[PDB]
Amino acid sequence: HMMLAALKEKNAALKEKNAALKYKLAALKEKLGLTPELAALEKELAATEKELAATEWELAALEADPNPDPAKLAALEKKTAALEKKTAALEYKLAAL
């Protein structure tokens, strides 16, 4: 439960970051036009968003489980860390524009 509570908080921060990146992306599209780089970053943001939605389903099932599988919890933890790195990389690509 302790490790699952932290994963829920990390997921919450990731959804908030993804939303703000959406508004930054759209703002950059206005300032610079639809450049091929922005189109690539939008495609990467849309993908990352879909993986974030999928892992929230895993959080919910693990929360409902009276004895949550440590293996599934560890799989979610590594997936959350990968998405945190992917989102931070996308944030840097956007800030560089």
Numbering used by the authors: -1 to 95
Paper's wording?
To alter thermal stability in our designs without compromising the 3HB fold and topology, we sought to destabilise sc-apCC3-CW1 systematically by modifying its consolidated, largely Leu-based hydrophobic core. For this section, this parent design with a single polar layer of Asn@a, Thr@d, and Thr@d (N-T-T) in the B, A, and N helices is referred to as sc-apCC3-CW-1NTT. As hydrophobic core packing is a key stabilising force in water-soluble globular proteins, we investigated whether introducing additional polar layers could attenuate core stability without compromising the overall 3HB structure. All sequences were evaluated using AF2, which consistently predicted clockwise 3HB topologies with high confidence. CD spectra showed a progressive decrease in helicity with the addition of N-T-T layers. Variable-temperature CD measurements revealed that sc-apCC3-CW with 0, 1, and 2 N-T-T layers were hyperthermally stable and did not unfold upon heating. By introducing polar residues into the hydrophobic core, we fine-tune thermal stability without compromising folding specificity.
Here we describe the combination of rational and computational design to deliver three-helix bundle (3HB) peptide assemblies and single-chain proteins with control over topology and thermal stability. First, we garner sequence-to-structure relationships from antiparallel 3HBs in the Protein Data Bank. This gives core-packing rules, including layers of hydrogen-bonded polar residues, which are combined with surface-charge patterning to design complementary sequences for acidic (A), basic (B), and neutral (N) helices. Next, AlphaFold2 models for both designs are used to seed computational designs of single-chain proteins where the helices are connected by loop building. Synthetic genes for these express in E. coli to yield soluble, monomeric, and thermally stable proteins.
